[PDB]
């Protein structure tokens, strides 16, 4: 039976979208059923911020960030802990998991 | 809502609804009398005109075709018919 009224795709009026590959297993999966995660982070972690600051010329370097949108498959997304199985009454909710920190 | 007048709905609701959906369907358009600074002739034009209307005396456009209604020529003075 229908487990998802949206079918998981989130297409609703296209018929076909262009697939994208998984970052882990390289699964040719449609771009909308290709759960996306925008990893924006520091090129140097908080573990080495002090070390870099003490041992860097150009006092108060901006310490540029790194940006990458990861296109996971769905099997990896279940397994690589990105997305989790949910209650059938919890599948309703599409909001992100409540603002990890405020 | 269960009891309500359709024979005499409010005129505000009349202007609220779409054309072709009133009690009796009536256009929302109207005509205008425009005067061009050139001569004293009064030209009758349409609100939603589709052509570059000019006075017969002078080759000066008075309206301009537009996806909706007419945009005038920045100097003509009109009165609603």
């Amino acid at each position: 039976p229908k487990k998802r009224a949206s079918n998981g795709r989130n297409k609703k009026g296209r018929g076909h979208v262009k697939p994208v590959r998984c970052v882990n297993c390289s699964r040719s999966v449609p771009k909308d059923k290709a759960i996306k995660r925008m990893a924006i982070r520091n090129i140097v972690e908080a573990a080495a911020i002090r070390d870099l600051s003490e041992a860097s010329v150009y006092a108060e370097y901006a310490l540029p960030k790194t940006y990458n949108k990861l296109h996971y498959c769905i099997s990896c997304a279940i397994h690589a802990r990105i997305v989790r199985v949910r209650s059938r009454t919890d599948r309703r909710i599409r909001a992100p998991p409540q603002r990890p920190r405020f | 809502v269960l009891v309500q007048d359709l024979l005499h709905p409010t005129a505000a609701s009349e202007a609220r609804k779409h054309k072709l959906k009133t009690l009796v369907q009536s256009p929302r358009s109207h005509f205008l009398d425009v005067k061009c600074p050139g001569c004293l002739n009064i030209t009758t034009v349409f609100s939603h005109a589709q052509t570059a209307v000019t006075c017969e005396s002078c080759s000066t456009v008075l309206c301009t075709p537009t996806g909706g209604k007419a945009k005038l020529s920045e100097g003509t003075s009109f009165r609603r018919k």
Partner: protein, 151 residues
């Protein structure tokens, strides 16, 4: 909201005013309006352009309101009605244009389907104009006849 040859559902149209008689503010003469229609037709204009010219440049809301006859009816009374009705002629022109575009490039299949649609519409309108006997019963549509009628 039918859109005979597509999936459209629009209803964009015009609502004819309730009052059939002439508008109170109109001062022109019906005979003058008929003369204007005749002159516009003699210029080589189809009835729709005649109506648009009368609505824009003049106070003619619509010919039937002012004169009592329709534009094509007025032209026919004076013997200026074209031998092919305007809508069918425009369909012929569109069909010949798409056929020209097709013969100038073969690989375009979408315009081929659109030409099929236009030809179906032409056939339907020709059938209607044939049962009313506007067109002779031998009137039909093939290649090089559309060009002859258009040119």
């Amino acid at each position: 909201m039918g859109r005979m040859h597509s999936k459209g559902k629009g209803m964009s149209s015009s609502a004819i005013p309730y009052s059939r008689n002439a508008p109170a503010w109109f001062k022109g003469s019906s005979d003058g309006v008929v003369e204007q229609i005749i002159k516009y037709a003699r210029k080589g204009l189809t009835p729709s352009q005649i109506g648009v010219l009368l609505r824009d440049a003049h106070g003619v809301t619509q010919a039937k309101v002012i004169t009592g006859n329709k534009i094509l009816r007025i032209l026919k009374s004076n013997g200026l009605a074209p031998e092919i009705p305007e809508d069918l002629y425009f369909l012929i022109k569109k069909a010949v244009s798409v056929r020209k575009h097709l013969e100038r490039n073969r690989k375009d299949k979408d315009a081929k389907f659109r030409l099929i649609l236009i030809e179906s519409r032409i056939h339907r309108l020709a059938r209607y104009y044939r049962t009313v006997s506007v067109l002779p019963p031998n009137w039909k549509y093939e290649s090089a006849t559309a060009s002859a009628l258009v040119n």
